[PDB]
Design a protein around this ligand. Sequence first.
Ligand code: ADE
Length: 233
Amino acid sequence: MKFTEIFPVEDANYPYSAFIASVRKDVIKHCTDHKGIFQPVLPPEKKVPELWLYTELKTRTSSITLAIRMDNLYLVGFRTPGGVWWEFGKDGDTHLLGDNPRWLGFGGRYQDLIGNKGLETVTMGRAEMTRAVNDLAKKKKADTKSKLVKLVVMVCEGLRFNTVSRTVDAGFNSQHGVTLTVTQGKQVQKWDRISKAAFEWADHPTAVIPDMQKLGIKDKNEAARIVALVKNQ
Ligand SMILES: Nc1ncnc2[nH]cnc12
């Protein structure tokens, strides 16, 4: 239950880099040092998550609160200014949130938000993220998918990958915005697997793992500079 330092998205005086930095520091307070594994290993998964990361994003005009589960740096939902909670999911699923919330209608996976398509297409940046927040706070009750998917890569994958927090910070104030490279996306969509190989590599640092080979990742060394935070078991 750690509340994140507010991130003034519209205020160009705050870097994207600090936001991330600040958050990981918070997150890490809860990770464990595993042998042979470079990166801090996240809290172990539980059907009902224990530790949560409440990270609010505010603009000149509005703000929303992000509900992310630590165990796997996944965005479970958000909060509108008026105190309403939207959770990824359909009627019948089980809730994890947080004060009477209203199933968003769709899950929060890439296939769900933009199936068959690659992260290289989701455009991101301070602007895009400002557009996103304001737009998502003006929500009552599907172009709020394209809005969530930006925050998903910007915030969630930014927390998970150095490779993302670097390409995003570098192009955050770009007019044309910033997008990941084909390869990055693929890699980003394989967080789960890279992580598993981080464990595999702790045991056999030598083992060649075609899945990582197939992603442009040679060894545990290369993966270490890509992923910041790892997963499980
Ligand atoms: N909603 C989400 N939050 C964090 N990471 C994700 N990867 C795919 N969907 C995600």
